[model samples]
Target: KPAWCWYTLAMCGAGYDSGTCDYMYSHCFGIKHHSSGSSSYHC
Candidate 1:
């Protein structure tokens, strides 16, 4: 991942965008992104 992406993941909150928060949550809450950039999670 890029440096900006790290910053975005650390500082960005849900209010910035559902998708960004979703991304962070996936990493922390144990969801994974494959090479295709797709997954399913509601937990």
Candidate 2:
């Protein structure tokens, strides 16, 4: 049920490898990650 997701490389530790955003919110669309080592998934 997440509408938007954001995670920083430092904060997330795992960086873009973390799949929780897509795994937990499979219904979301346009999933993408950022270029600044930060990740973002949009719904």
Candidate 3:
């Protein structure tokens, strides 16, 4: 048993992936949000 961090490009609608990690940094409703100085961002 262990913790995991989730990530999704389509949010809870379609596509998503996750794995074991230390902690989470962010979240989304129906989109993906990249950090600063990024190229593409969906939110």
Best by TM-score: 1
TM-score of candidate 1 on Cα atoms, chains taken together: 0.29
> Which stretches of candidate 1 lie above 4 Å from their native place?
1-14, 31-43
Using lDDT as the yardstick, the better of models 1 and 2 is 1
- Candidate 1 per-residue lDDT over residues 1-43, each given as its tens digit: 5565666666665457457755665655454643353564542
**Native-referenced Cα lDDT, model 3:** 0.32
Stretches off by above 4 angstroms in model 2 are 2-18, 27-43
The pairs that clash in candidate 2 are: none
Per-model TM values vs. the true structure: 0.29, 0.22, 0.13
Q: For model 2, how does the per-residue alpha-carbon lDDT over 1-43 read when each residue is reduced to its tens digit?
A: 3434343323344654456545443444455444353455552
User: How many clashes in candidate 1?
Assistant: 0
The positional error of residue 36 in candidate 2, measured at the CA in angstroms, is 18
| Superposition-based RMSD of candidate 3 using all C-alpha atoms, in angstroms | 10.0
Q: Rank the candidates by TM-score, best first.
A: 1, 2, 3
